[PDB]
Scaffold this active site. Structure first.
Site, PDB file in Angstrom:
ATOM      1  N   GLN A  60      -7.642   9.728  -6.041  1.00  0.00           N
ATOM      2  CA  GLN A  60      -6.651  10.483  -5.417  1.00  0.00           C
ATOM      3  C   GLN A  60      -5.540  11.044  -6.122  1.00  0.00           C
ATOM      4  O   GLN A  60      -4.873  12.172  -5.884  1.00  0.00           O
ATOM      5  CB  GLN A  60      -5.682   9.318  -4.515  1.00  0.00           C
ATOM      6  CG  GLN A  60      -4.846   9.870  -3.425  1.00  0.00           C
ATOM      7  CD  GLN A  60      -4.147   8.945  -2.807  1.00  0.00           C
ATOM      8  OE1 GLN A  60      -3.808   7.862  -3.136  1.00  0.00           O
ATOM      9  NE2 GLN A  60      -3.738   9.270  -1.367  1.00  0.00           N
ATOM     10  N   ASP A 103      -6.890  14.524  -7.649  1.00  0.00           N
ATOM     11  CA  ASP A 103      -7.064  15.321  -6.604  1.00  0.00           C
ATOM     12  C   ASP A 103      -5.423  15.741  -6.230  1.00  0.00           C
ATOM     13  O   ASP A 103      -5.223  17.076  -6.200  1.00  0.00           O
ATOM     14  CB  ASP A 103      -7.204  14.658  -5.500  1.00  0.00           C
ATOM     15  CG  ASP A 103      -7.313  15.457  -4.037  1.00  0.00           C
ATOM     16  OD1 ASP A 103      -6.200  15.917  -3.538  1.00  0.00           O
ATOM     17  OD2 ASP A 103      -8.403  15.696  -3.609  1.00  0.00           O
ATOM     18  N   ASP A 151      -3.195  16.169  -8.821  1.00  0.00           N
ATOM     19  CA  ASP A 151      -3.288  16.927 -10.030  1.00  0.00           C
ATOM     20  C   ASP A 151      -3.834  18.362  -9.718  1.00  0.00           C
ATOM     21  O   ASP A 151      -3.134  19.173 -10.159  1.00  0.00           O
ATOM     22  CB  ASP A 151      -3.819  16.226 -11.239  1.00  0.00           C
ATOM     23  CG  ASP A 151      -3.107  16.813 -12.662  1.00  0.00           C
ATOM     24  OD1 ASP A 151      -3.355  17.925 -12.795  1.00  0.00           O
ATOM     25  OD2 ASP A 151      -2.899  15.983 -13.568  1.00  0.00           O
ATOM     26  N   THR A 209      -0.849  23.084  -9.959  1.00  0.00           N
ATOM     27  CA  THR A 209      -1.710  23.970 -11.097  1.00  0.00           C
ATOM     28  C   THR A 209      -3.234  23.555 -10.870  1.00  0.00           C
ATOM     29  O   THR A 209      -3.447  22.384 -10.876  1.00  0.00           O
ATOM     30  CB  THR A 209      -0.990  23.583 -12.375  1.00  0.00           C
ATOM     31  OG1 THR A 209      -1.266  22.319 -12.854  1.00  0.00           O
ATOM     32  CG2 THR A 209       0.336  24.109 -12.396  1.00  0.00           C
ATOM     33  N   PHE A 224      -5.049  23.406 -13.307  1.00  0.00           N
ATOM     34  CA  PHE A 224      -5.499  22.694 -14.423  1.00  0.00           C
ATOM     35  C   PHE A 224      -5.136  21.168 -14.397  1.00  0.00           C
ATOM     36  O   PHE A 224      -4.136  20.933 -13.818  1.00  0.00           O
ATOM     37  CB  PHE A 224      -4.605  23.215 -15.584  1.00  0.00           C
ATOM     38  CG  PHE A 224      -4.840  24.886 -15.838  1.00  0.00           C
ATOM     39  CD1 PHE A 224      -5.762  25.114 -16.422  1.00  0.00           C
ATOM     40  CD2 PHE A 224      -4.022  25.512 -15.496  1.00  0.00           C
ATOM     41  CE1 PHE A 224      -6.175  26.539 -16.503  1.00  0.00           C
ATOM     42  CE2 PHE A 224      -4.047  27.128 -15.651  1.00  0.00           C
ATOM     43  CZ  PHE A 224      -5.382  27.464 -16.104  1.00  0.00           C
ATOM     44  N   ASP A 239      -3.520  18.510 -15.758  1.00  0.00           N
ATOM     45  CA  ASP A 239      -2.546  18.934 -16.818  1.00  0.00           C
ATOM     46  C   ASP A 239      -1.270  17.977 -16.346  1.00  0.00           C
ATOM     47  O   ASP A 239       0.010  18.334 -16.800  1.00  0.00           O
ATOM     48  CB  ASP A 239      -1.656  20.269 -16.628  1.00  0.00           C
ATOM     49  CG  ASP A 239      -1.440  20.843 -15.326  1.00  0.00           C
ATOM     50  OD1 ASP A 239      -1.640  20.044 -14.290  1.00  0.00           O
ATOM     51  OD2 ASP A 239      -0.888  22.013 -15.288  1.00  0.00           O
ATOM     52  N   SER A 284       0.330  17.732 -13.639  1.00  0.00           N
ATOM     53  CA  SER A 284       1.433  18.410 -12.752  1.00  0.00           C
ATOM     54  C   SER A 284       1.950  17.238 -11.837  1.00  0.00           C
ATOM     55  O   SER A 284       3.064  17.635 -11.214  1.00  0.00           O
ATOM     56  CB  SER A 284       0.747  19.642 -11.954  1.00  0.00           C
ATOM     57  OG  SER A 284      -0.509  19.420 -11.472  1.00  0.00           O
ATOM     58  N   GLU A 307       2.859   8.510  -0.316  1.00  0.00           N
ATOM     59  CA  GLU A 307       2.181   8.342   0.960  1.00  0.00           C
ATOM     60  C   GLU A 307       1.474   7.054   1.076  1.00  0.00           C
ATOM     61  O   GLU A 307       1.171   6.667   2.260  1.00  0.00           O
ATOM     62  CB  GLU A 307       1.002   9.526   0.622  1.00  0.00           C
ATOM     63  CG  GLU A 307      -0.012   9.633   2.059  1.00  0.00           C
ATOM     64  CD  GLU A 307      -1.273   8.712   1.983  1.00  0.00           C
ATOM     65  OE1 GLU A 307      -1.466   8.426   0.646  1.00  0.00           O
ATOM     66  OE2 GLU A 307      -2.134   8.589   2.902  1.00  0.00           O
ATOM     67  N   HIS A 349     -11.840   9.460   0.935  1.00  0.00           N
ATOM     68  CA  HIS A 349     -11.510   8.912   2.001  1.00  0.00           C
ATOM     69  C   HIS A 349     -12.417   7.850   2.740  1.00  0.00           C
ATOM     70  O   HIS A 349     -11.969   7.041   3.451  1.00  0.00           O
ATOM     71  CB  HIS A 349     -11.234  10.330   2.918  1.00  0.00           C
ATOM     72  CG  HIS A 349      -9.973  10.743   2.712  1.00  0.00           C
ATOM     73  ND1 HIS A 349      -9.818  12.305   3.436  1.00  0.00           N
ATOM     74  CD2 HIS A 349      -8.934  10.880   2.078  1.00  0.00           C
ATOM     75  CE1 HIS A 349      -8.743  12.808   2.843  1.00  0.00           C
ATOM     76  NE2 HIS A 349      -8.239  11.894   2.002  1.00  0.00           N
TER      77      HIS A 349
END
Ligand code: HEM
Ligand SMILES: *[C@@H]1O[C@H](CO)[C@@H](O[C@@H]2O[C@H](CO)[C@@H](O)[C@H](O)[C@H]2NC(C)=O)[C@H](O)[C@H]1NC(C)=O
Ligand SMILES: *[C@@H]1O[C@H](CO)[C@@H](O)[C@H](O)[C@H]1NC(C)=O
Ligand SMILES: *[C@@H]1O[C@H](CO)[C@@H](O)[C@H](O)[C@H]1NC(C)=O
Ligand SMILES: *[C@@H]1O[C@H](CO)[C@@H](O)[C@H](O)[C@H]1NC(C)=O
Ligand SMILES: O=N[O-]
Ligand SMILES: O=N[O-]
Ligand SMILES: [Ca+2]
Length: 595
Positions: A105, A108, A110, A184, A186, A188, A190, A258, A351
Site C-alpha cells: 500500500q 502504491d 508513492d 510522482t 518515481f 522517491d 513522495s 485511510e 486488496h
C-alpha cells in the site's frame, strides 16, 4: 498522441541541470523530456483506451451499448458472485506477515493517485449522486443488483465519481480521455515529502535550521514524534469518533489516514527522516536546513527503493522477478518512467491480501489489553486509536507477528472492505472496494483481460474450457463466463487476480508481467535511482546496502525484538532476535570534511 503538447501544467519548470536533488514534482528527472514521471500529468497508456464511444464514456454507461456484443455486468454483481466470502477461517498467508500487505500500500501511494474530478464545493450534484443515484457527467454510481442485501438497507446505489483527466477538466479533448497521476511516478518517498511545492513546504520545519519535518505539537508517543494533524474540515477521522475528536494526519500523501496501519507506516517514515537529519547535523554541523532536509530525503528515498526492489518485489513476482526486473545496468534515459493506467489496477492485487482484523500486541507479543484485536472496518480513518490507545508500537508488533490474507479464488476480498468500507463524505461503513475497483477500470477506459494477455505474450482464452485451463478452476471460470460472456470482456482487475499465483510469488503470470514491466521502468528510467553511478558515493552505497525494515523499526519505536526478514511470516519468540543483532545504517560516508 493525437495532438502532442496539450498539457495544462507544462511550463514553470526551470530545470537546474546541476541541481543534485530530485525536484518535489518529479520534473527535470529526464533531461530531454523534463515532464516525464512528474506529478499532475496523464497516466501513460500502454495500450489505447477503450471507451464505449471511443472517447470518454465507460463501458456500462449506456445500457443498450454492448461490449463485443454482450452487456457488461454490474460491478457489484461481480463483487457479490465472485469476490465475496463469509468464512475467514483458513484465509491467512502462512508465509507473509501483515507488513507485506502494508508495504504494498505504501509503495502504491508513492507511485500513483488518480483523484476524483474536482467538484468538492457544496452542491446538489455530489449529493444528488449519493441521494438520487442519477448517472450523469462525473457521477457514475454503482447500482445494486436485485437480490443485493444492501438494497434493503442502503438505497439503490453506492456513489462513485469519475477520475480527473488532463487538458479541459469539465469539457474534453479529441483523443481518448486520459486520467491524471497526482503523485510522482518515481519511487522517491513522495508519500512522505509531498508531490506539490505547497505541501512539501507546509510539511517542513522551517522554524529551525535543522532540516526537520514538522511533527505533532499536541501529542507524543513515549517521546517519539507523531505526524502533524491536518486541520481542515470536514475531517473523516473526526467524523468516525466525534467524542475523541482526533483529526487525520498530514503527510506527503493525502490518503495517509485511510487505515491505522498506513498511518502507522507513515509515522515510521517521518521519524526516520528526522532521525537522519539530526544524525547528519552532528556529522556535518556546517550544513544548513535545506542541505539537511535534502540529504535526509535522498537517503529515505534510497531506503524505499532498496526495501522495495531487494525485499518486496522478489516475494511478489517470485520466479518471474528475473524475467522482468533483471539486475541493474544503470540509468537509461530512453525508458519511459511514467506509471501506466493499467498498473494502477494491477497493483490493486493488494486488496486481496488485507485480512479482516488488526491486533495490538504488547512487548511479549501477547494481546495488548482487552480489545487488542479489532475489525478492520473500525480502523478506517482512525487516528484516535493511535493517539489515545498505545501509540504506534503495539500496531507495529502486530504488523510483524500477524499475517496477510492469502489470495484465494474462493475468498478474494474480505467483507470488511467489500461491504463495510468507509469513504469521506458518505457517512456509512457500507461501501465495496471490489465494486469500486471494477467501476474504476471502466472509468479509466481499460482494455479487457485478453487484450492484456495479448500484451504480455500469453494465450487468450476464448471459451469456458480455455478459461478453465488458464484459471485452473472450473467453477470460477463458469461464474466469470456467466457474468461476462467472453473472456475478452473480463475487467482486468478481476481477470488478473483470478489467475493462480506463480511459484514463490503472490500474483499470477499476467499481473507479474504488468507489475514487473512497470517496476523495471521506474528503476531504469530514474536519473536519481540510488545505485546510479554518481547519485551516491561508493562508500555511501555500501552503508545503504545494509538497510532493513527490521532496523527502521528498531531506530524509530521502542521495540527491541524483531525478525530479520520482516515480510515473511514470523512467530515470536522463535523467529525474533534482539535489535542489537540487526545491522545499522552507518552514516559516516556522509561525513563531509568540507574545510
Ligand atoms: C486496508 C487496506 C486498504 C484500503 C482500505 C484501501 C482502500 C483503497 C481505496 C478506497 C482506493 C480508491 C479506489 C478508487 O476510488 O478507485 C484504493 C485504491 C488503490 N489501492 Fe488500496 N486499499 C488498501 C490496501 C491496498 C494495498 C495493500 C495495495 C497494494 C499492495 C493497494 C493498492 C491500491 C492502488 C494501486 C490503488 C489505486 C491508486 C490510484 O492510482 O488511484 N491498496 N485503495
Ligand atoms: C471514541 O473515543 C473514546 C475515547 O476518546 C472511546 O472510549 C473512551 O473509550 C473507552 C470506553 O468504552 C474507554 O477507554 C474510556 O472509558 C472512554 N472515555 C471517554 C472519553 O469516553 C469511545 O469508545 C470511542 N467511540 C467509538 C464509537 O469509537
Ligand atoms: C521544529 O524544531 C524546533 C526545535 O528543533 C522544535 O522545538 C519545534 O517544535 C519544531 N516545530 C515543529 C512544529 O515541528
Ligand atoms: C534502453 O531502453 C531502450 C528502450 O527500448 C532499449 O531499446 C535500449 O536497448 C536500452 N539500452 C540500455 C543500454 O539500457
Ligand atoms: C517463505 O517465504 C520466504 C520469502 O519471504 C521464502 O524464501 C522461504 O523459502 C519460505 N519458507 C517457507 C516456510 O515456505
Ligand atoms: O483531513 N483530511 O483527511
Ligand atoms: O488509500 N486510499 O484512499
Ligand atoms: Ca513517487
Amino acid at each position: 498522441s493525437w495532438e502532442v503538447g496539450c498539457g495544462a501544467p507544462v511550463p514553470l519548470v526551470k530545470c537546474d541541470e546541476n541541481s543534485p536533488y530530485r525536484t518535489i514534482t518529479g520534473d527535470c528527472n529526464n533531461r530531454r523530456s523534463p515532464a516525464l514521471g512528474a506529478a499532475n500529468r496523464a497516466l501513460a497508456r500502454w495500450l489505447p483506451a477503450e471507451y464505449e464511444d471511443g472517447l470518454a464514456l465507460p463501458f456500462g454507461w449506456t445500457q443498450r451499448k454492448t461490449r463485443n456484443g454482450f452487456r457488461v455486468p454490474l460491478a457489484r454483481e461481480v463483487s457479490n458472485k465472485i469476490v465475496g466470502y463469509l468464512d475467514e477461517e483458513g484465509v491467512l498467508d502462512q508465509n507473509r506477515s501483515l507488513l507485506f500487505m502494508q508495504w504494498g500500500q505504501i509503495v502504491d501511494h508513492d507511485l500513483d493517485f488518480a483523484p476524483e474530478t474536482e467538484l468538492g464545493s457544496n452542491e446538489h450534484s455530489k449529493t444528488q449522486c449519493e441521494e438520487y443515484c442519477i448517472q450523469g457527467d462525473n457521477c457514475f454510481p454503482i447500482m445494486f443488483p436485485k437480490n443485493d442485501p444492501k438494497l434493503k438497507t442502503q438505497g439503490k446505489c453506492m456513489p462513485f465519481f469519475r477520475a480527473g483527466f488532463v487538458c479541459p477538466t469539465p469539457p474534453y479533448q479529441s483523443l481518448a480521455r486520459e486520467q491524471i497521476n497526482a503523485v510522482t511516478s518515481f519511487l522517491d518517498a513522495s508519500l512522505v515529502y509531498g508531490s506539490e511545492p505547497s505541501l512539501a513546504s507546509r510539511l517542513r520545519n522551517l522554524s529551525s535550521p535543522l532540516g526537520l519535518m514538522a511533527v505533532n505539537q499536541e501529542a507524543w508517543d513515549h517521546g517519539l514524534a507523531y505526524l502533524p494533524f491536518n486541520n481542515k474540515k470536514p475531517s473523516p477521522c473526526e467524523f468516525i469518533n466525534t467524542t475523541a475528536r482526533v483529526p487525520c494526519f498530514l503527510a506527503g500523501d493525502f490518503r495517509a489516514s485511510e487505515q491505522i496501519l498506513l498511518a502507522t507506516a507513515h509515522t515510521l517514515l517521518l521519524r526516520e527522516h528526522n532521525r537522519l537529519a539530526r544524525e547528519l547535523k552532528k556529522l556535518n554541523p556546517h550544513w544548513n536546513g535545506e542541505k539537511l532536509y535534502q540529504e535526509a530525503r535522498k537517503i529515505l528515498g534510497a531506503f524505499i527503493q532498496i526495501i522495495t526492489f531487494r525485499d518486496y518485489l522478489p516475494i511478489v513476482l517470485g520466479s518471474e522477478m528475473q524475467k522482468w526486473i533483471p539486475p541493474y545496468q544503470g540509468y537509461n534515459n530512453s525508458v519511459d518512467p511514467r506509471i501506466s493506467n493499467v498498473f494502477t489496477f494491477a497493483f490493486r492485487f493488494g486488496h486481496m491480501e488485507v485480512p479482516s482484523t488488526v491486533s495490538r500486541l504488547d512487548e511479549n507479543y501477547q494481546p495488548w489489553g482487552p480489545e487488542a484485536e479489532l475489525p478492520l472496518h473500525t480502523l478506517f480513518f482512525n487516528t484516535w486509536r493511535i493517539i489515545k490507545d498505545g501509540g504506534i508500537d503495539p500496531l507495529v508488533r502486530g504488523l510483524l507477528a500477524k499475517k496477510s490474507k492469502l489470495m484465494n479464488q474462493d475468498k478474494m476480498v474480505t467483507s470488511e472492505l467489500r461491504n463495510k468500507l468507509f469513504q469521506p463524505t458518505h457517512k456509512i461503513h457500507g461501501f465495496d472496494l471490489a465494486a469500486i475497483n471494477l467501476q474504476r477500470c471502466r472509468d479509466h477506459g481499460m482494455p479487457g483481460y485478453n487484450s492484456w494477455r495479448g500484451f504480455c505474450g500469453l494465450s487468450q482464452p476464448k471459451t469456458l474450457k480455455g478459461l478453465q485451463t488458464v484459471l485452473k478452476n472450473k467453477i470460477l471460470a463458469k461464474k466469470l463466463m456467466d457474468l461476462y460472456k467472453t473472456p475478452d470482456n473480463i475487467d482486468i482487475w478481476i481477470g488478473g487476480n483470478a489467475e493462480p499465483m506463480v511459484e514463490r510469488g503472490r500474483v499470477g503470470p499476467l499481473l507479474a508481467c504488468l507489475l514487473g514491466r512497470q517496476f523495471q521502468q521506474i528503476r531504469d528510467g530514474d536519473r536519481f535511482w540510488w545505485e546510479n553511478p554518481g547519485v551516491f558515493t561508493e562508500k555511501q552505497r555500501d552503508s545503504l546496502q545494509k538497510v532493513s525494515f527490521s532496523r527502521l523499526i528498531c531506530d524509530n519505536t521502542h521495540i527491541t525484538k524483531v525478525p530479520l526478514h520482516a515480510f515473511q511470516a514470523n512467530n515470536y519468540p522463535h523467529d525474533f532476535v534482539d535489535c542489537s543483532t540487526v545491522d545499522k545504517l552507518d552514516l559516516s560516508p556522509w561525513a563531509s570534511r568540507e574545510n
